[PDB]
Ligand binder design. Structure first.
Ligand code: HEM
Ligand code: HEM
Ligand code: HEM
Ligand code: HEM
Ligand code: ECN
Ligand code: ECN
Ligand code: ECN
Ligand code: ECN
Ligand code: F
Ligand code: F
Ligand code: F
Ligand code: F
Ligand code: F
Ligand code: F
Ligand code: F
Ligand code: F
Ligand code: F
Ligand code: F
Ligand code: F
Ligand code: F
Ligand code: F
Ligand code: F
Ligand code: F
Ligand code: F
Ligand code: F
Ligand code: F
Ligand code: F
Ligand code: F
Ligand code: F
Ligand code: F
Ligand code: F
Ligand code: F
Ligand code: F
Ligand code: F
Ligand code: F
Ligand code: F
Lengths: 399, 391, 391, 399
């Protein structure tokens, strides 16, 4: 297929061939914006290369940015960039230590029931109409509760909070309700932060406040806690949506794979893994070299940005065999990059996995013969996170 | 004595330490016993600092502006600007847009508004014999100008300054930040359909934040925050920092009293001696050699503007003292090069005004040096309290 | 349940967790939430652990033997051997010399001395109905043999064990370490002109420490320390660990009571089921692939000897239970390959003796499983207290 | 001159030409023991290369050993190796943090008087005999007091402690008094450690005990504190001796340089720096690569040991000019490697510097026209630390 090109809503449907293209012919692809040559960068597509890069945080930095956009830490450009910039060990270690305290196994169990309740409520509402938009009806609002949960947002506010969430996530002058939501969200948290100073819980934010972040005047601290929550509200929400929605077409395309999980629900957890591999909600993130580095026969100059195609890595035939491109709920894939590897390995991987499990389990139980109108599926914009905005669902069984 | 990052108790007199460095260790090496890897260098001579600032490709700003490699560690104590600028080409565009909010029309337009406040507050002080000139005037003063450049509508200036003064400060500032944050979100929204001439309007007009951006809208708020705090302290610093200087040299003030036509030139001298931004670091993007010393690539190098301005090698023997008639050239109070301060004009205007009115309405005033209280912070040197007395 | 490094409260029954791993996650990946970089793998199947241990060039020992990358951080809590062995070629020479202190003559020579103590203490216990068989016998017992291999003269064995028992334990052990340290320095000095057949004599005879070496003399002391502690706990572990097993399966004991000619074979079975050294890590020297999983170079990989020995894929369905008649082959209680235990013989002898005398003089004994107390430590599993009762 | 070859007492006199040889012709010299080829290693001699290597602790590890001896962390071989093995950041960071607490400026001031007292006592005793062995009479016992000081050894024990010190430092069956000293030293410290558990000072050791090292049973901890003290007693003692003694011939060879410091004692501190550069007590230490690394046109395989010739680096003409080999007390040398650079930059650099200053100052004041019988100077064994055992001194002025 075509050569590298950052993804758009139009290209998100089948980026797989471009990946194969790169993997089979330009493992270390050099991109040179024809107009702005000073912003050239590289793209890694082979599982092996992407894997090493992600892990070797010493050579491939994060604190410079996570996208191929050099103006990332400035003002112009942004739009498609994480709200917060992550540091590298040792600097990053304090943070990871503290925030991981709000990301324990109890955190998952404590909110799983809520997840299932909602999943079942919406699933049955859809069985009522014998169809609908499973993304709009379930996979979009679903993650918001988990994110609110991890952020330490009290139930009374859940209603209000989800409001703001949905206004912002919708961003991509309809986005005016967005600037508004952000402000609202903004003030809310400075409040919640205040509340936590003396009424701490065990949510990530409580552990940062309790640890002193944004304490006695420390403005920069408070600001970063905010940057964190907004990064969670935005990304933590639609990465899960991307997984759930993105899984629909994969399953639809193969009822035999669906049948396996039907006669034996035990395969679901493993299936979630295979689904995670193929969907790769976070298709790719970039790094900045901290010294001239040589991969294969290409030598990426220091200071250059390199995009790690996690999505291509999870589909690399070299790592997963000939059928890498196909769905195999029994595959039990090892070394997937869906959550990356190394210092920043996703803290909510078990939260996402739980959500996928509950969702897929309930779905397969109540809508054993669902169908997806692929052709009518809509993909969100952005070049890094691959999620669907709309997924025409329809249980070939009603009432 | 040996070099060391300043503190509120060491800010009263860093001058000797600077001389020491300029004279005996131009390219000073600091090696923290606890962390020899988190080592850095300190340039103190005017010629070097000047050349360093001008050479952005070699001395980058995109790594931080502090000598602390672990600055971005949420741990605590963040003596650092609420956000950091990139270097060209990246910075070029940003700077180009924001500079449209820093035009001559911009500075001129608010001057009258500023002079009025200065006079009102000065007279309020004469009506009391004295008072703390920093909290009473110098602190609130720079607040207005920031708002003016951020495009904050006048009616709000009262409510706004309300937060400003809480943030630049029992942490009710958290609330102040939330309020101000949300405030700006609306102002940005608004600016999408009412593009004035403020920096923010020019940014929003470019597409920043204008689209449920997030990140983009957050960087807008980071910038507004930098201005809100940095823009206050620096002016507060210079205006307050000038008090003891003018107090100590009555002969100088006399020159300005007999001939106020020399106040603009005095403003330069005062800026040279105050250097509110005593220093800011950079990070070598390659191994660079200065004199005998060679600084490895990726090393923080603190540019001591404050010292460079007092460098005898540049301003003569008396470089260390007040000479309102000096008319110093090439000062580094606003750095040099790609990051040269955009609010230099705005900064100068506030002092030309403030100083003129001070001298014109309180020709005879006294400052209790001994009772001045400096703020903390190793990079920006400003007084928290400067007891004033007109008589 | 999910995998996790053992603790004194989890040592009572790890068997289920192992099964789980062997059956569902042969090459288990552990990713610490606080430190995803300090991640590692856990091999639990006999075939893999066996192959891992045999392949030293790929799975090195010279990085540490714990899954904790920050093991050598003085911070605190050091669940790790008092020193670490290198891999061939380096290890080859060391092992060659030290192995001369682990000869057949060596094991045979002290057996009688050992059996006597066993009998004395066993009778002392019969004279009291019972007592704690670990503190009363199993703990002091392995002490003698170590001393014997370290070349500690018998008269001292009393004073020596004195320290041993203090160290293997209000930290009067610090003093015990100092005393023992100095003790060995003299013994080494001595050995320069009185080279016996102990391991130390063979080392000193080679030139180690013998020259105001330091380092060299300190490594001698590190080794003697490893032996002193490790060599005790492991045997203490196996002997004590066998108590509940023999207690639980009276039918088994009966087989040994009617025919004590089957005790040597029972010793193997008991070693297979106790695996005092439940596990020890290695560090991949290259990217290596096991099954679907690929472990990156420089990754700690915990070899679960304890699990490999209970692997049904190797010993059949009942692999999980006591069959003194089994005569298990290729157990991993003493690892395999370049680091295969040198004191395997010495270890086996102490149990052949201890067990025979136990069964011969207390055919009818009881162990209060419910009241056994395990020691801490995630790699060596031994009981601190095993209340004994003869009746 | 000849090709690389680890130093011996016989070769320590003038190793400078071998260095130049390497620098000018084999900057990345490959050494291959003819008999044990598996133990091949590399040697860096150019200031630039040695400097980068020392700093880049990520690539060039320390925790594997500090010498070119691969059996370093085992048993056979040792002899010429540090008693303790240093870790790499982050692991090493805790230690550095705690021990540096006992290495403050006060620590120097608090013991400087003692240094000067002793220096003057011995100097005058030598003026008495109008000569003697300045190493045996002063530069050998001198450092012991500072080391005892930093280790937190109470004055009453000073007598006893120095005894053991001298017995061990003498190591290189006369070394029998050594094995004895070590044992004595050994037990002493376990005691001192005990004492510190409740009677802590501000000496390095107190900070480790107070921090918990070797606490509630932690045997490994206690053992490492010991390894540290023995590393100080051995190395901390004779590196200073190497500097002081080694400086004698350098000064002797140039009375004009000595004259400068005579008419202006201010130059002494700077002189100490130039002396430090030329003496390089720690001529070199090795590192182990943690990945294939390429210097120039040579690519040192990972896992290989590399010797960083600090002594050659300080003499590199490229860094210090044409006269790099000569003494210039006004040179004011920048970037010297005498104390290394990076994570392990010597903690006692200011202590050594103080000693050199006091010594050199007193010497130049009381023995302005001393002489050294170079030909009769004796060098200690070992390939890493270059110190003299004997230095025939003689003030061409008596009484
Ligand atoms: C299927 C959904 C998800 C995917 C694919 C995903 C993916 C990722 C990836 C790849 C990273 C690291 C990016 C890099 O630097 O390469 C990351 C980090 C992280 N994720 Fe997720 N994530 C998901 C859901 C979540 C959720 C629901 C939460 C929160 C409840 C979460 C919390 C975080 C946090 C806090 C980190 C930062 C860890 C660090 O920097 O050490 N993620 N995620
Ligand atoms: C006493 C008065 C002030 C002083 C001494 C001061 C000093 C500085 C310095 C040293 C820099 C460059 C720092 C570096 O990169 O090393 C700077 C940049 C800047 N200042 Fe100020 N400043 C003052 C007042 C103001 C005010 C009131 C504003 C406007 C509201 C302002 C806006 C800025 C901006 C936006 C830049 C960044 C320019 C760029 O990055 O291209 N400054 N200032
Ligand atoms: C219950 C009895 C014992 C058990 C289960 C045991 C277990 C082990 C294991 C697992 C190893 C290899 C560890 C590895 O590298 O992964 C080992 C090595 C060794 N053991 Fe033991 N051991 C026991 C008793 C003893 C005794 C009493 C001595 C002798 C006094 C001894 C001396 C050693 C030595 C010196 C080695 C190292 C060999 C080498 O590195 O080449 N062991 N032991
Ligand atoms: C002229 C004399 C001395 C020289 C040339 C010297 C040299 C060195 C060097 C080169 C290192 C680091 C080696 C490497 O890894 O490359 C070192 C580390 C150190 N030195 Fe010295 N040293 C001297 C005197 C002392 C003294 C007197 C003390 C103690 C009072 C001392 C305490 C230490 C300590 C504790 C470190 C370890 C720091 C760390 O690992 O972070 N040194 N020394
Ligand atoms: Cl603290 C933190 C920082 C970064 C990331 C990861 O980057 C997030 C994805 N994400 C978010 C949550 N879980 C996954 C991201 C990528 C690309 C773009 Cl354009 C936007 C976003 Cl939000 C995760 C936590
Ligand atoms: Cl966009 C921008 C970024 C940085 C700077 C300059 O850095 C500011 C000073 N400042 C602020 C305004 N005018 C001057 C600063 C330095 C040190 C410390 Cl601790 C705090 C602050 Cl705020 C200027 C604009
Ligand atoms: Cl020279 C040598 C080095 C290591 C080992 C083996 O490692 C020992 C076990 N051990 C000791 C003796 N026989 C067995 C050990 C493991 C874990 C923990 Cl936490 C402590 C210890 Cl002590 C054996 C000789
Ligand atoms: Cl904690 C620590 C570890 C290592 C070193 C440094 O290595 C020391 C030199 N030294 C010692 C003190 N100051 C300098 C050394 C090198 C070579 C040889 Cl053969 C022996 C020794 Cl002792 C310094 C502290
Ligand atoms: F798009
Ligand atoms: F660029
Ligand atoms: F890898
Ligand atoms: F139901
Ligand atoms: F139904
Ligand atoms: F302060
Ligand atoms: F001065
Ligand atoms: F000069
Ligand atoms: F840090
Ligand atoms: F323009
Ligand atoms: F307006
Ligand atoms: F001038
Ligand atoms: F005016
Ligand atoms: F005063
Ligand atoms: F435990
Ligand atoms: F089981
Ligand atoms: F299987
Ligand atoms: F660590
Ligand atoms: F042999
Ligand atoms: F004997
Ligand atoms: F078998
Ligand atoms: F027997
Ligand atoms: F029981
Ligand atoms: F020698
Ligand atoms: F080797
Ligand atoms: F360098
Ligand atoms: F005298
Ligand atoms: F005299």
């Amino acid at each position: 297929s075509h050569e590298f090109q950052l993804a758009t809503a139009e290209t998100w449907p089948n980026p797989w061939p471009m990946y194969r293209a790169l993997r089979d012919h330009d493992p270390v692809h050099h991109v040179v914006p024809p107009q702005r040559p000073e912003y050239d960068y590289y793209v890694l597509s082979r599982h092996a290369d992407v894997w090493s890069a992600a892990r070797d945080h010493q050579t491939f930095s994060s604190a410079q940015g996570l996208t191929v956009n050099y103006g990332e830490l400035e003002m112009i450009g942004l739009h498609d960039t994480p709200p917060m910039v992550m540091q590298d060990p040792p600097v990053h270690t304090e943070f990871r230590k503290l925030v991981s305290r709000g990301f324990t196994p109890r955190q998952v169990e404590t909110v799983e029931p809520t997840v299932r309740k909602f999943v079942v409520e919406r699933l049955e509402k859809l069985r009522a109409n014998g169809g609908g938009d499973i993304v709009t009806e379930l996979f979009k609002p679903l993650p918001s509760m988990v994110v609110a949960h991890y952020l330490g947002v009290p139930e009374e506010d859940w209603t209000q909070f989800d409001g703001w969430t949905q206004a912002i996530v919708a961003a991509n002058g309809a986005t005016t309700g967005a600037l508004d939501a952000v402000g609202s969200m903004m003030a809310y948290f400075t409040g919640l932060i205040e509340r936590r100073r003396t009424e701490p819980a065990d949510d990530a934010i409580s552990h940062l406040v309790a640890a002193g972040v944004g304490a006695d005047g420390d403005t920069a601290g408070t600001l970063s806690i905010l940057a964190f929550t907004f990064t969670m509200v935005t990304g933590g929400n639609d990465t899960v949506t991307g997984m759930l929605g993105g899984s629909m077409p994969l399953l639809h395309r193969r009822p035999d794979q669906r049948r396996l999980l039907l006669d034996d629900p035990e395969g679901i957890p493993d299936a979630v893994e295979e689904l995670l591999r193929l969907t790769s909600p976070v298709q790719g993130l970039a790094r900045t070299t901290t010294r001239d580095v040589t991969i294969g026969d290409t030598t990426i100059p220091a200071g250059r940005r390199v995009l790690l195609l996690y999505g291509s890595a999870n589909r690399d035939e070299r790592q997963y065999g000939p059928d890498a491109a196909e769905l195999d709920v029994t595959r039990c894939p090892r070394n997937i990059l869906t959550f990356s590897h190394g210092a920043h390995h996703c803290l909510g991987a078990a939260a996402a996995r739980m959500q996928c499990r509950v969702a897929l389990t309930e779905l397969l139980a109540r809508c054993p013969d669902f169908e997806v109108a692929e052709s009518r599926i809509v993909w969100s914009g952005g070049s890094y996170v691959r999620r669907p905005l709309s997924v025409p669902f329809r249980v070939t069984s009603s009432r």
